[PDB]
Nucleic acid binder design. Sequence first.
DNA 1: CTAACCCTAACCCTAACCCTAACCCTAACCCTAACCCTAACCCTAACCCTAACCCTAACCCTAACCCTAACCCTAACCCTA
DNA 2: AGGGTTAGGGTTAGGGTTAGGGTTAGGGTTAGGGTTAGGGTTAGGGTTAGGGTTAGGGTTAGGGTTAGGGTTAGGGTTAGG
Lengths: 98, 99, 100, 100, 100, 120, 65, 84, 87, 87
Amino acid sequence: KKRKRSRKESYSVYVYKVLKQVHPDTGISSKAMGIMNSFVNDIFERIAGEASRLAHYNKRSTITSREIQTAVRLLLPGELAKHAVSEGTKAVTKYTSA
Amino acid sequence: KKRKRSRKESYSVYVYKVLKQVHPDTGISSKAMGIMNSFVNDIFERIAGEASRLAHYNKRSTITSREIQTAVRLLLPGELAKHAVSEGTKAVTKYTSAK
Amino acid sequence: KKPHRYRPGTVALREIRRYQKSTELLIRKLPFQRLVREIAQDFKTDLRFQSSAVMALQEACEAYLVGLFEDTNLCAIHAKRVTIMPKDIQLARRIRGERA
Amino acid sequence: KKPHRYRPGTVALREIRRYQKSTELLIRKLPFQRLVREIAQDFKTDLRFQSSAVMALQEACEAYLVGLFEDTNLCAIHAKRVTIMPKDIQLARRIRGERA
Amino acid sequence: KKPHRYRPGTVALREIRRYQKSTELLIRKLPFQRLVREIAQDFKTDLRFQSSAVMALQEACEAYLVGLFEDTNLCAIHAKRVTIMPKDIQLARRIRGERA
Amino acid sequence: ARAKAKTRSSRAGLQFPVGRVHRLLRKGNYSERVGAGAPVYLAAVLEYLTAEILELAGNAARDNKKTRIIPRHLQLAIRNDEELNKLLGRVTIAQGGVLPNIQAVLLPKKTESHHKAKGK
Amino acid sequence: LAGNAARDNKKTRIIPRHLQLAIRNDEELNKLLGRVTIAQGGVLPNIQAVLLPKKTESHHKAKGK
Amino acid sequence: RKVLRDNIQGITKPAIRRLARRGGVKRISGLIYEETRGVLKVFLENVIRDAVTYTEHAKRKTVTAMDVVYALKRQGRTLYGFGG
Amino acid sequence: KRHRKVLRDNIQGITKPAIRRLARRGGVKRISGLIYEETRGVLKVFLENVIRDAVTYTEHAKRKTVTAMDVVYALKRQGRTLYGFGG
Amino acid sequence: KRHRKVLRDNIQGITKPAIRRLARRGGVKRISGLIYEETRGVLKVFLENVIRDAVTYTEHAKRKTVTAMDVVYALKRQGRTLYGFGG
DNA sequence: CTAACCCTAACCCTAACCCTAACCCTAACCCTAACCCTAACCCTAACCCTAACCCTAACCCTAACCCTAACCCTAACCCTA
DNA sequence: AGGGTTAGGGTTAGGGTTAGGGTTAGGGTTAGGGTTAGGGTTAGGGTTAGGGTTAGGGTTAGGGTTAGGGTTAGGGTTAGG
């Protein structure tokens, strides 16, 4: 009858943009794009699940930047966790300033 | 304490009643009671999380007896899951017959 | 009368290297589909699987078998041996926690 | 069974049977309490450990050590041996997936 | 309103000349004493150093740092650059034979 | 009115959908309230991880005389990076092989095998 | 160490090449004998990543795209 | 028509040999094929039972790669590529 | 007063008879000599990880005292659920 | 009884302008921000290598005090002979 | 409406001293296991090639997914026992 | 109040079907080298003990610390365009 087919959400445009920002000469196949889409979704679900567990342990019905920073330091290892925390702090500082 | 303090929650009364029902003239310890409470809480949280995940996968928003039965069949093994499903169906039938 | 027969070892080593430097599959697809269909027949009748589903199943099974073979080879090397054994497979499954 | 000399290997079996029927802590508290405080110094100073945290820490450590020793003993008899060795603990930890 | 701001370069050059035409020290003494005490704590406990000893240590460390900075600046100048880099420091330590 | 509608990605400087992250946090049944800086933090962390993984994959592809990124190069970079291997330990990449790691005992050192006739 | 190197090199006797290989392989031995050069012995075949073919893409111009 | 006894034999001997060579096994014993087939059959039985339970919960009659990936992740084996 | 602090006489705190009794409780007849050092190192690494997790949890909770609840939470996050002590 | 700060100068004192003063002595005009950490690290490892030899020299005569003579004797072994302070 | 603010009640964590007493350290003797050498078998390495068989290239179609249209019952929020 | 239920048609899609030839396995064959059986060597800790470092309460005090309660205001929420 009608068209109106469901639209599947994906991060293919953001991964390709990061690729062009890092290596503006390489390409990403469809399988690699699907792998990166499953990796981003799995990490996002693991961090959101860790932040929800922290918000449920401490009697507080909110999720601020501290809950995400703690979930990052608990999931990521050493240097990666510190770099991600520094990037997040720089981002929130640029947001609170600009 | 008793200085406008807060009261926790537990299942000691229910565990003691279940123990008295399944076996009279027996006893239990505080460590065993705490272990049983932790086991009940862990199983409850696991089944609730499994039901929520199944409801999110089914593109639905309500966790019902079907979702709970599926979570039980996925978590519990074989004959234990079958007996739990039978008891749950009997309880649902009793609730439907009388409320 | 010399085909220059290879001593047992070099052929195995070069085959290991050739199979490690590749990304293709090894087990066939139709026998695996028949196997998973026969297994699914023991639960619900009149079942229709998927090509991507059986492909992911074959990939996961091949990865699990590769890991089990690696663990068995490591156990055999630790046991002053070079060949795998069913006792080594049993000990690997017992340590990994699969025995049940 | 003279009280001067006993056959080596027989007193260990009685000790194993006697220690496998008790639930008391084997590691002592005071030597273990200082190890917990010394580790927490590198992370953050001015920390107060509760009286129930060290007990759970010691219980978990004892359980992990018992499991590792059982795995090492299971790996020891595989090579026609009866004693444990440092080369077996490494393999037992690598098969479990802890050392990676 | 005007303060006649100096362009980046003249201040650095005059500071280099002023620090080269002097014989005084740069690093403080009490922090260096605390540092060498913390380092000596990792070997033998209850150690008492000397004022002349820590002074000679600070002098030798300052001379070694000056030499390393000179080598790094020379490497940067050879690399068509004017600023130092950790890769330049690593290459200088690799050529000098200090490794890591 | 409304002047102009600036995008959250442009105001944040990142290349990740902060709006989609916030919508997923609000509709994911994680919490009744979702903060403002939390989606930006998560987007920045995910962008850094994706950038690191893509840089490793591009380096592997350039070392393998290839221009495109393949799952084989992705698995090679993941197994090479110790922190990535420790993070994704229970993740199996499809259409990808392992590293050609041959043990020292499996290498051919028969040394004439001996045991046979006295070749002295 | 020399016997292990000789057994790995399919040899029975110890040669100065195997001695130098074992010395350069052992970190503590290399740190102890840093200013000692073994005669009749070569270095290890260590090739840098930049010296490897490709990666640099020697197409340079490549008339096309 | 399909011989349910001619399915464990479907995992041929050269296939298991090539899998062991890809893993890093030089010599493969004779009694390894039967144990490998049994372990693979048990694992496939568990995964297919999980997929059947998921399909019955979804009120469907077709097993999908999404359900297979969900079951594999529930067991502790996250697979990428096939799905999302 | 108390003019002293903890030292490295802590790895040696895990005495040899304690490790021997633990191995006997597990089921080990003969214990090698080089097992005590490796066991102490593994126990130190595990305790370091668990204490780091507990310190992170305490810093997230805006507190300065590590509790058995936080210890149990960290142990469950690793994959070792402990009962009895807590709830 | 004891200092509440048990950090014992965790490679401190080597501040940014302190390094910005030693580098200008050699001739460095533009000092990169990623140089302070490497400078602190190399200073720490050099001080460790020197203090190890100093303690090894002081422990021979059953003495519990480190003098400048032992320091210059240990520095002579590394290849840097200092005049004046030792003697 | 819930989280950032302040006063503050009480708790729980730490500091410090004792009394030996279960437990820990070494060094004294000795038995049997870990380990190297070696030799006998039979087990699987290495073909192998003709037959098993599979996936390649398509057609279909009828059971199944679900899309968007109608409609109501189940779920929640309120208060107060 | 709207998520779930029902009936309805479209619409992708997987099972069923054909054939074949090019890839590969099945069962029997020659024979190498690894395996577990053996016996000889060595030192590795097992077992006992008695000198003695140090641990579990037994019973105090002090002042850090969590937060109970109250106040209030602002960030997440809801809605439509």
